[PDB]
Write a protein that binds this ligand. Structure first.
Ligand SMILES: *[C@@H]1O[C@H](CO)[C@@H](O[C@@H]2O[C@H](CO)[C@@H](O)[C@H](O)[C@H]2NC(C)=O)[C@H](O)[C@H]1NC(C)=O
Ligand SMILES: *[C@@H]1O[C@H](CO)[C@@H](O)[C@H](O)[C@H]1NC(C)=O
Ligand SMILES: *[C@@H]1O[C@H](CO)[C@@H](O)[C@H](O)[C@H]1NC(C)=O
Ligand SMILES: *[C@@H]1O[C@H](CO)[C@@H](O)[C@H](O)[C@H]1NC(C)=O
Lengths: 49, 79, 44, 98, 47, 113, 99, 49, 49, 50
């Protein structure tokens, strides 16, 4: 007999992949693009745009 | 690093001379394209050309810049 | 061949068939219109 | 040993006039203090007199390949000296292993 | 000290999908209006 | 290892070509001549309709032999083939282009002259 | 515009790559020359600085080639623009499909 | 030394190909002008067509 | 070391640019964003009549 | 004449500089290849030759 309230925690494992990081003029990250997820995302990070 | 550069100081001679030749050739390209005439012809104040409207290509005195309205659009279009 | 070591050959965008079809239309316009087809609408 | 948040010079470590051998590929002695290093580590161990030759970048043997492999960019200074009056004793000193 | 639990009925674990999650700063530098790529450990998108 | 049609003299093992590459070998089991041809040819390519137009893309292989259309310039996947011919904007090669037309998807067709 | 944008983008990418060259080791143990001087003696680090000289010389030698090639094609382009200026603008050109 | 030996063969071929691409483009430009003048009209330039 | 007008996030010590050159660093003590700009620019030229 | 003098001077200065290239060591210990062969053995002086 016990109670634990209500909670939910997610566990995920990191993998070594190249990520294209976007920076604004304030210096914070706004979006990230992978290179090994989608062919469209691969084109975005090879063109660096 | 500079002591070992004397063994390749001849290599740096062509590289400095090639870019000097490139820079002087880029300068020489402008006078061969734009400086055909040696006299600056002033636009007449009368704009009556038989119905031909030339305000779009001739410079306008409303702005301090001497560029045409289509040149100003051309200047801001390319980064 | 010369493609066994990764030295591949990229085929052209236009093959010999449509280049020949270009020349045939250019020859047909020359003999039927002169030069007006190359400077505007094609006359006869 | 890890040295962090500390100031350490090396002129006092060199003018002892007691070290038998001095294999230091860090910097020359005059220029080893003016510039900066992030972290100075210390790997201290004992060895015989016939195996100090094998402790060098690019050498083989039975100790430099099986106990501590020296990389090609081994900037670690090796300071070695004789202290046989303290770490050895009559009857056979077998407290050191390899 | 610790005690042991008793056997009871649980629920099997479930699997969900991430949506643009697991992105952190890979370095302690400042970058402004640039698009640079780094090779580090990140969570794959839609994994 | 393909089945060749050229017979080797009965004293040799290997075989070269005009480009001087070992592309022919004799199997010592029962003396048959087998050719050698690499399996990896060229690279990959991606067709993008562009920004603010679509999101899907088509993957093109340069010199790899195989929804999926076997074009003259390799394999094109992710783009359907249509027998109709229009003017094209994205070149592919060998007189075949790709475009985004009518929902609407990426299509491949012969370029109309 | 494509003809006015490629001549600038190709420079900036080529100018950016020259900066990228100093971030590579060229087979050495470090990229910046100051590190190997500060972590190795100059008599022993002569090999690493020499391969940094050859790697940076070749990148500069490579960079000069396409700049000279790019200067050649614009010289053809400037010559074409000069001929078009002298013919199509400074008079009426009878050359069909030229202006 | 094999990396830089095989490297040094490549830009020599690339610089050779770039020069060959330059003269092909110059020849293609000459053929394009000849196409625009000699075929698509009558050229008054004597000893040109 | 000029006085800049851009602030950093309170976890970054360095600062780079589009060309990936460290041209901005904050001080460990006073947290001052001081820009970095080299002094030696170009060469010299001689005008001879 | 400017267009006629540059094609000769630039070739002459390129021909002159090739001779100047043989007077440099390229990081070696001598310029002339006969010197290292005379004072060093060919098994050891192979790296300086290459
Ligand atoms: C020549 O064309 C320009 C177009 O730019 C005309 O200028 C416009 O004139 C209309 C009529 O009054 C105005 O409403 C617009 O604001 C003007 N635009 C600009 C950019 O000035 C000009 O009037 C024409 N001139 C002649 C003589 O036809
Ligand atoms: C982010 O940048 C905007 C300018 O687009 C500015 O107004 C805003 O203050 C910045 N955010 C912070 C936290 O300074
Ligand atoms: C590609 O492979 C398939 C099956 O392996 C074969 O039927 C087809 O002929 C091949 N294509 C070519 C061009 O050889
Ligand atoms: C296009 O039309 C021809 C007409 O015979 C037909 O053979 C072909 O299968 C058609 N292509 C498609 C993709 O339906």
């Amino acid at each position: 007999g016990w109670t634990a309230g209500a909670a939910a925690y997610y566990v995920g494992y990191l993998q070594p992949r190249t990520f294209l990081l976007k920076y604004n003029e304030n210096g914070t990250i706004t979006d990230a693009v992978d290179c090994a997820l989608d062919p469209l995302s691969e084109t975005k990070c090879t063109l660096k745009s | 690093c500079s002591n070992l550069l004397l063994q390749y100081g001849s290599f740096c001679t062509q590289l400095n001379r090639a870019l000097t030749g490139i820079a002087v050739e880029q300068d020489k390209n402008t006078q061969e394209v734009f400086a055909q005439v040696k006299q600056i012809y002033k636009t007449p104040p009368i704009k009556d050309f038989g119905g031909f409207n030339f305000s779009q290509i001739l410079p306008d005195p409303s702005k301090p810049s001497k560029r045409s309205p289509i040149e100003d659009l051309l200047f801001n279009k390319v980064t | 061949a010369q493609k066994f070591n990764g030295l591949t050959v990229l085929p052209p965008l236009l093959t010999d068939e449509m280049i020949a079809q270009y020349t045939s239309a250019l020859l047909a316009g020359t003999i039927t219109s002169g030069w007006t087809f190359g400077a505007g609408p094609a006359l006869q | 040993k890890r040295i962090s948040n500390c100031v350490a010079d090396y002129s006092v470590l060199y003018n002892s006039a007691s070290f038998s051998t001095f294999k230091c590929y860090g910097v020359s002695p005059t220029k080893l203090n003016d510039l900066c290093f992030t972290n100075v580590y210390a790997d201290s161990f004992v060895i015989r007199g016939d195996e100090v030759r094998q402790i060098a970048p690019g050498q083989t043997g039975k100790i430099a390949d099986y106990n501590y492999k020296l990389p090609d960019d081994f900037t670690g200074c090796v300071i070695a000296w004789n202290s046989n009056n303290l770490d050895s004793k009559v009857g056979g000193n077998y407290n050191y292993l390899y | 000290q610790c005690v042991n639990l008793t056997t009871r009925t649980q629920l099997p674990p479930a699997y969900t999908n991430s949506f643009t999650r697991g992105v952190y700063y890979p370095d302690k530098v400042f970058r402004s209006s640039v698009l640079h790529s780094t090779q580090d450990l990140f969570l794959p998108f839609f994994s | 290892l393909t089945e060749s049609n050229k017979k080797f003299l009965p004293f040799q093992q290997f075989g070269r070509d005009i480009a001087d590459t070992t592309d022919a070998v004799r199997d010592p089991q029962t003396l048959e001549i087998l050719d050698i041809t690499p399996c990896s040819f060229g690279g990959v390519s991606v067709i993008t309709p562009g920004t603010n137009t679509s999101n899907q893309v088509a993957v093109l292989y340069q010199d790899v032999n195989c929804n999926v259309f076997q074009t003259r310039a390799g394999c094109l996947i992710g783009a359907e083939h249509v027998n109709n011919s229009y003017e094209c904007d994205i070149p592919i090669g060998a007189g075949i282009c790709a475009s985004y037309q009518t929902s609407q998807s990426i299509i491949a067709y012969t370029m109309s002259l | 515009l494509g003809k006015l944008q490629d001549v600038v983008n190709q420079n900036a990418q080529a100018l950016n790559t020259l900066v990228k060259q100093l971030s590579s080791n060229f087979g050495a143990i470090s990229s910046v020359l100051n590190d190997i001087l500060s972590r190795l003696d100059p008599p022993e680090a002569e090999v690493q600085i020499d391969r940094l000289i050859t790697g940076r010389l070749q990148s500069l030698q490579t960079y000069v080639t396409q700049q000279l090639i790019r200067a050649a094609e614009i010289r053809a382009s400037a010559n074409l623009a000069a001929t078009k200026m002298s013919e199509c603008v400074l008079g009426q050109s009878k050359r069909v499909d030229f202006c």
